[PDB]
Subunit: 314 residues, 5 copies
Amino acid sequence: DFEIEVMNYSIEEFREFKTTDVESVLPFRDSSTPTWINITGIHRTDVVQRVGEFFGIHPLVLEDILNVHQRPKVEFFENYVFIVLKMFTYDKNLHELESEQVSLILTKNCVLMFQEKIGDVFDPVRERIRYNRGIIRKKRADYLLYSLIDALVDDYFVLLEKIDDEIDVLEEEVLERPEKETVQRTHQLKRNLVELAATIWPLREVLSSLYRDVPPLIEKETVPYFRDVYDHTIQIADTVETFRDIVSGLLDVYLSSVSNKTNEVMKVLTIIATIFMPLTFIAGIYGMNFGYPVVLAVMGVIAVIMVVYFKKKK
Amino acid sequence: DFEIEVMNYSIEEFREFKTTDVESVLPFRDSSTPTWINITGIHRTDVVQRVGEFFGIHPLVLEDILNVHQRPKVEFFENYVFIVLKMFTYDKNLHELESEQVSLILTKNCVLMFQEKIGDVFDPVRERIRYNRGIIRKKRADYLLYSLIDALVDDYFVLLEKIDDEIDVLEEEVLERPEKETVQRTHQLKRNLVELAATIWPLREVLSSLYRDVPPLIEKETVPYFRDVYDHTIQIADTVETFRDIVSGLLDVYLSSVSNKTNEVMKVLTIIATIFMPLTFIAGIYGMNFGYPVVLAVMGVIAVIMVVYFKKKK
Amino acid sequence: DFEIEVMNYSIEEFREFKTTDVESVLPFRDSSTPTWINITGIHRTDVVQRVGEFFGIHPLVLEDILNVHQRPKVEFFENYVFIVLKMFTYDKNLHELESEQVSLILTKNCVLMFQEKIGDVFDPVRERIRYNRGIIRKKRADYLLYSLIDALVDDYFVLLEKIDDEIDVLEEEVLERPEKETVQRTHQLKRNLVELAATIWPLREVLSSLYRDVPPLIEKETVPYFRDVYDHTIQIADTVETFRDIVSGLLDVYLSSVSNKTNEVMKVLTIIATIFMPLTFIAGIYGMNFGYPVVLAVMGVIAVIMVVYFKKKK
Amino acid sequence: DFEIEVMNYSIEEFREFKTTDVESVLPFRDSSTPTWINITGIHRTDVVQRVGEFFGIHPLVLEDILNVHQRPKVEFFENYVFIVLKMFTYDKNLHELESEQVSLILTKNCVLMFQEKIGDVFDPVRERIRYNRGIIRKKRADYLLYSLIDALVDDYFVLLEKIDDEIDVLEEEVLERPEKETVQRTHQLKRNLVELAATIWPLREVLSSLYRDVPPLIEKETVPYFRDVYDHTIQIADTVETFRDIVSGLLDVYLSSVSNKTNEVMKVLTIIATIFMPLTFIAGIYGMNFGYPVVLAVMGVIAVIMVVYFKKKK
Amino acid sequence: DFEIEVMNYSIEEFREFKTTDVESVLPFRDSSTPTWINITGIHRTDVVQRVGEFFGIHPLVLEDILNVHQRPKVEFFENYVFIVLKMFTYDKNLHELESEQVSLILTKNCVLMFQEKIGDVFDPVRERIRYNRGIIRKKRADYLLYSLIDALVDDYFVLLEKIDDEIDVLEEEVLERPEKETVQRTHQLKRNLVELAATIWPLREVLSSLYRDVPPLIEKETVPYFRDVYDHTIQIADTVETFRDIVSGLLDVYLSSVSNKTNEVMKVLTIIATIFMPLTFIAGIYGMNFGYPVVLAVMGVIAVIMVVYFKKKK
Ligand SMILES: [Mg+2]
Ligand SMILES: [Mg+2]
Ligand SMILES: [Mg+2]
Ligand SMILES: [Mg+2]
Ligand SMILES: [Mg+2]
Ligand SMILES: [Mg+2]
Ligand SMILES: [Mg+2]
Ligand SMILES: [Mg+2]
Ligand SMILES: [Mg+2]
Ligand SMILES: [Mg+2]
Ligand SMILES: [Mg+2]
Ligand SMILES: [Mg+2]
Ligand SMILES: [Mg+2]
Ligand SMILES: [Mg+2]
């Protein structure tokens, strides 16, 4: 896929368009009114290059934009702030989660964006812009980021939800469903949970590090805003920790459950054994080729003497 | 529910009413005598919105009062100090804990509050101002906050008291009651203890950060008072950690109990089968179609060669 | 119980008595020769109240002396240093430890103590004053504290010694005595260790904080003395963490020992069954109602094709 | 093996050769153009001895170059910098990893290297120089180090990829392949990870030390280059953790898949027993020597009373 | 035992002798040429007392050298530097490790030592002095210290080596030797590892603390030396952890290997049981007392309908 979307807006108005030409966005560098140049489809490296070059982005900072397998970070430069993030997509049921990586380059009045596939969680932001809702138009571009970012971080809540409600189910399946591939299901969660954890802890650190310093900040306007996002990014990485703490000691339940049922089966076998082994032994004697109720009575009394004795076991 | 209580008190005198009108409590802003404007029922967004606009509160902070799914935190501002706390209910028997979110805003001589349902642990703190008991009237309106806060933390101790006695019992249940749902009951405790853990450790931080700084403090009057509640907050978060440390290694005690019971049955089975196998074999042989006490003697001896050989196993 | 002992002493002299009157001790506030006012029995809150009120002790601080369920701490004030400490009693056999809380208040030339029950580990110290042994009399009253403390921390060694020698035994019980109430006897330990380890880790911190600061110290006379009690305090809390780590991987030994014994039983069943199923089957067909050493030969022969085959398994 | 290979180059041009002679490289100490003196074969302690003494290197450092069983480290000196590193080789299938130590000495315009065997992951670096690709020729000799180092670190990624893929398979081996030597295949991995873990966490520290300090650096040319390696270095020593954390809880699946299967076996064995045990006993009673379908029906009716009762277990 | 040894040496010469007299060593105090007054046999408390007093040592400091049950530490004083350490003796095979305590006091030109039994790991040090090997004579008496310590620390490598190889074996013993007291052999390993890990971590800090400060150091002569001991000291403390991480999750393996084998046994027992229970039932029916190849055919066919059905289990 490949599609470039821009949303230049001022305090008063805006336009939007989805051109697939490269050059038709460059002039916006000098635009003194907040623009949002979203470059969906990063597979075309020729485009990032040209843009990179124009805006005065470093060559390595570009490369990072291209290399998806990277830990989220926040780089501070002389001209532009560069952040990378990774939003997720849990395939509910098909227990497995997938990870697109989005890169953000803030410069003057331009929030430059780089997605690798169409679709995101930024719909809410563009439209609040679209039909002027909330305080987005009123404020500058450095805010705009701290809107996109708010948007991304929000998404993780959804997942958590999904996961809580996953846990809730995959808890029940140990307690009272000792079956086969519950086990495998469990281990798919921890896996999922670890994988996640080390993408929030570093993302947490981004909004952590984006808080301490900040050059184009508009101090008491954009800052105390994203404190309330940094705050989110905490809870996220707090919650996770909770999950990875309950999930951790779950398999153990399963085992207790199972090694407890094994007790039951074993027990019945033993009890059946213990009465008809001897009773079939007596009657074995009396197939020897070398009072009929006398033997049955004694048998039938022994088969009691047992079932009694088995009231310390039941 | 919705019921707005107010306790304006000076060094000599106080009143107390229950009006459901939003307006009839605003003029206490400039009342220079310690007020306590309790707002029960945070479902009514319109009333917080009004009182928040009037007291000068930030918009994002109000949002947080309304959003119950948030960690405990304390926010220091130019005019007011904002605090977010959680108080718990443990339903004994039905092993499960429930959580309501109290928020507090101290501004001049107004300890402004926000509960989401009727009923709370602040009964004694309002009663101690009622029949003038202790030093609550005598001291200012920022002290009032550190009377409520003490009440909320003092409740937590009750929860620990319920849980200790719980564990007490639910431990016996592993040692001397190896049954079925003991398993799940225990996992319900860890669950509950993690859930807790993540709600004191932050609350503990509240009273820890509420220590280091503080602008309306009255240094050596109210600060060395809550040092005593920040202390309480520690102990809590230490006790919780003791529990989650004893509860942790409990399933392994059950497992053991049961992977030992397995053995017993497993054992008895084998002695039975081990003896009445061959005896039911010898007495099998002698059902062939192709000294009676010779065979019985030789049977009745082997079954003793076995019993004695089985004094390495008993 | 109630019994207030005192021991004032100078470089030259001392007395000792066991009055049970409250005021007969108050005049020792201004005594410029080291005085040790022991208040055994904290149940008489009135007694505490008076003394406290007299010596100028803060109200909350008095509460702490009466409230036994607290983490050991060292409070620094303008006039007096206030410590809270706990000392234990391990009932050998009945595997269960008990806790009494000692509170200490150092002021000018008064070390003001608070025990709840008669009988302590302070018997050597008063004796060392009694029969002027060592450098006690010689030195001041702040040193006196660091002679009680030492004695408190030195008892803990006794405990560790007990528990070492308790572990040792309860370790053998796993390896070479895989029985029943080993399991519970073990959990009792981790229980007792956690309990403990959350009482030293804090007590450590007291001597750690009593090191970094200190107003009545006599720098190079008392400070480098209790370095070598803060030293001990580290060791104890180092030793405890040793125990809580060995013990930690203990139950897991048991399970393996049992899950291995099960194997033996399981295995012996199978050899038995695996021969005397078919030999009773053979001998089962030859009871059919529709060369005697020919069948005994082929029976006896398979009964070795078996035992031979079972020389991969033994 | 033994084969010393050098690469002196300037902004304009370069040469390469592979002399076995020790002396034909020493004159490059004063070659003002960047020289790369690769010494493959550190077994010849004489060759090392010589080149060391000439370059004014300390003795102890040399030893380290000859000692392979050492943690990677960086040692800063007045004249030169010294680094020790280790690269790895994973034998797929034969689950085991082998470790050659590489050591580096930067001085003026001399990157001095020490391989213990022929073959390395530096093929590209020499190649990029060879066909003047990228910015290698252009920049100084201190930059050259931070090209070797990169290629080495980059190697590690390949390992991680190998293992990820390994994990992915050996994970399926517990889920859906509960066999025998998966057990040992698992541990091995833990074994191999730790071994790794503890060679990255220090190698990570090297590039962490190499970043804070640095005397020959060319500040804003080389220093911000290797940050992006330092970076890598983080990611790796992060990812490792991921793995180590997943694998950790893996054997607990297997165990669970096992204790579950035994249960099936245990069950089958029980129900065959629980029905034919009695039926044969009846048909035992009627082999006594002291309406035919009467018995068969009562048998066959019983055999149904079982199978139905055993619809609670299937 | 008891045998005081001394080795005063200078840039040029030395003597050695093994007096049993306490005084014959005192005069060295003032010797301006490095002396090493090794006092083996600390059971004679009278000796230590005397010399302690003569050198000007503190009384508590002496006690420490007389109390062997103590953590390694580095006390810095006005005149002297005091250090305590421990050296070990792993009884190979008799899986258990023994711990003697060495005590060191550096003062001017007097490295004063305190062993409790004959034999140690300082042999190499004394002789490098004996037959002027290396830079031991050349340098001062401080340096002497950082030669002994080098020697002691160098012993730990032996231990590790002895343990690394112990693990290698006591690992196999799980995979491929599921016997009995292998179990206990691995708990003895953990046991031993923790015992160890609690005396390096502190021995590590001592060379950490000996690094940060140091008064008689000879800055760029003896300091940079022991940097390469502290170094060693870290690796030691590093590898130990590696071990106490492999050995940790080993018992697990053994569990999985035996809960696997319990599966086979269980299995076999089952198949044998699941054919000859009904076949012996058939032939049970035909021992009733109320086409010979007809029954044999139908029995035999079943006994293949089975064997085929059990191609899902093998
Ligand atoms: Mg990059
Ligand atoms: Mg939001
Ligand atoms: Mg939930
Ligand atoms: Mg918020
Ligand atoms: Mg209270
Ligand atoms: Mg088991
Ligand atoms: Mg208190
Ligand atoms: Mg002592
Ligand atoms: Mg000491
Ligand atoms: Mg376990
Ligand atoms: Mg070295
Ligand atoms: Mg690269
Ligand atoms: Mg018959
Ligand atoms: Mg050496």
